[PDB]
Design an enzyme around this catalytic site. Sequence first.
Site, PDB file in Angstrom:
ATOM      1  N   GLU B  51       0.823  -1.205   0.000  1.00 55.59           N
ATOM      2  CA  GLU B  51       0.000   0.000   0.000  1.00 55.59           C
ATOM      3  C   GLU B  51       0.860   1.259   0.000  1.00 55.59           C
ATOM      4  O   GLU B  51       0.450   2.293  -0.538  1.00 55.59           O
ATOM      5  CB  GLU B  51      -0.946  -0.059   1.204  1.00 55.59           C
ATOM      6  CG  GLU B  51      -2.057   0.984   1.299  1.00 55.59           C
ATOM      7  CD  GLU B  51      -1.603   2.289   1.920  1.00 55.59           C
ATOM      8  OE1 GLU B  51      -0.664   2.252   2.746  1.00 55.59           O
ATOM      9  OE2 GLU B  51      -2.181   3.346   1.599  1.00 55.59           O
ATOM     10  N   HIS B  52       2.047   1.190   0.600  1.00 58.61           N
ATOM     11  CA  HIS B  52       2.992   2.300   0.483  1.00 58.61           C
ATOM     12  C   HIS B  52       3.626   2.357  -0.901  1.00 58.61           C
ATOM     13  O   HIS B  52       3.813   3.445  -1.460  1.00 58.61           O
ATOM     14  CB  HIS B  52       4.070   2.186   1.554  1.00 58.61           C
ATOM     15  CG  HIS B  52       3.578   2.540   2.915  1.00 58.61           C
ATOM     16  ND1 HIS B  52       2.576   1.832   3.542  1.00 58.61           N
ATOM     17  CD2 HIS B  52       3.929   3.532   3.764  1.00 58.61           C
ATOM     18  CE1 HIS B  52       2.331   2.377   4.719  1.00 58.61           C
ATOM     19  NE2 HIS B  52       3.146   3.403   4.880  1.00 58.61           N
ATOM     20  N   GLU B 128       7.171   5.296  11.181  1.00 55.88           N
ATOM     21  CA  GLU B 128       5.805   5.595  11.564  1.00 55.88           C
ATOM     22  C   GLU B 128       5.416   4.664  12.698  1.00 55.88           C
ATOM     23  O   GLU B 128       4.870   5.103  13.694  1.00 55.88           O
ATOM     24  CB  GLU B 128       4.837   5.492  10.381  1.00 55.88           C
ATOM     25  CG  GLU B 128       4.713   4.122   9.748  1.00 55.88           C
ATOM     26  CD  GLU B 128       3.859   4.139   8.497  1.00 55.88           C
ATOM     27  OE1 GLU B 128       3.143   5.140   8.281  1.00 55.88           O
ATOM     28  OE2 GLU B 128       3.900   3.156   7.730  1.00 55.88           O
TER      29      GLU B 128
END
Lengths: 75, 403
Positions: B51-52, B128
């Site tokens: 997804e990144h 993150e």
Amino acid sequence: FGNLARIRHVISYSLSPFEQRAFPSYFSKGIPNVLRRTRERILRVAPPFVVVYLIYTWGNQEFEQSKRKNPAMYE
Amino acid sequence: SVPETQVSILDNGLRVASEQSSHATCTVGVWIDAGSRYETEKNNGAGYFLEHLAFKGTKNRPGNALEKEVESIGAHLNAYSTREHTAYLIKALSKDLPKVVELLADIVQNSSLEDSQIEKERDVILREMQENDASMQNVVFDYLHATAFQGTPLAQAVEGPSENVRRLSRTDLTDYLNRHYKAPRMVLAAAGGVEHQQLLDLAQKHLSSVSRPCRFTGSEIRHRDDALPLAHVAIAVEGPGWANPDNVTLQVANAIIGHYLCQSFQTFNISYSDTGLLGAHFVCDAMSIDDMVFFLQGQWMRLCTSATESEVTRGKNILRNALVSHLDGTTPVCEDIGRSLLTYGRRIPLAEWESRIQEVDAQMLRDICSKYFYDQCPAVAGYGPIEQLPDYNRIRSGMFWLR
């Protein structure tokens, strides 16, 4: 409660009573553990009571001998 | 007369649904039945890391030129991943409908994962996560999932453990991509100013290439860290799943519960494929911790025992007013459409939702609440100054009444 102590970053997992076996490996490890326990404490506990048993018997027998008539006496 | 969501699955298996609205702006998305539940602990962050990587360039559109295209029409590009579904959606104008679909086609297939990028996105993801711990409610809900679904693929988080994140390679990703991106497990959903026949023709033109025991566990997990100012506590029981209709009734009950004591009360009904978490996540000061609980458990038992018609009517009105979730906005509807086709296999119209709401009365609400809340073993997740948070016997005893 809530003020009893200050701990940090100590996670603590647990299970519901009905979800876990009541006596997990009860005799499986219980016996080994009980035996483990007895061997860490038997040398500190037992020898005083052993010499109590010897002193008790000794006292009894000695007392009897004390009571036993002196054959040499009265003759 | 709810606008129907016309659906046109492809032979490959790509269901293509769309709903037309006045809005000259249209939101088009791809939903994939692929999440952290389909990962096998050796690729626990593959969906997140893909997804990144999915917006960093494809084979046909190498690098930032791709996102230059989605800047050129002024469109917005979003993606998200849950434990069961992955979504890539674009909000754009109506007249830019073809190129957007073509863009989405690249994002699902022909995507390019650059090794250079892999290291950069690893540092992004790693960092993150290294700071994600900051968000408490996310930590508490991850703890609740872990302790409620221990030993299953539903315990593991969407992001995965830092370990896997560091230890991931193109080929692994390629696998997850080539394994969980099948055409029969994909929905092309469109909401707003779109024509269904044009969208079906665009899906035939591009995207026509896509290749063709869940268990709850009651357990007390407690992350004690007394330096935090506030405590977050979530208590849940097992949910029914997506396809079980009494969810609707449970939604009413959740509504009736609402939020009355310590601040930050809330209620959730998270649903996965024939499972879920139904409960509450409050957050509070040291003392309120217990009472709130006590408070909270009392409300649940009241809904199991003493539900009246007025609060049921209020909960039904709140749920209907919640159908606004569907609304008319391109994004929300599209999203809704996306799940409908992945979970139910069809788009449930709002009239059917209204019928299922109006058939709910007080007797079946307290019956279903007694079925799902009364004398059940909960999953508890606490984070913060949680010493006065009661242990499992007190919560389990609060899960029923002696009267």
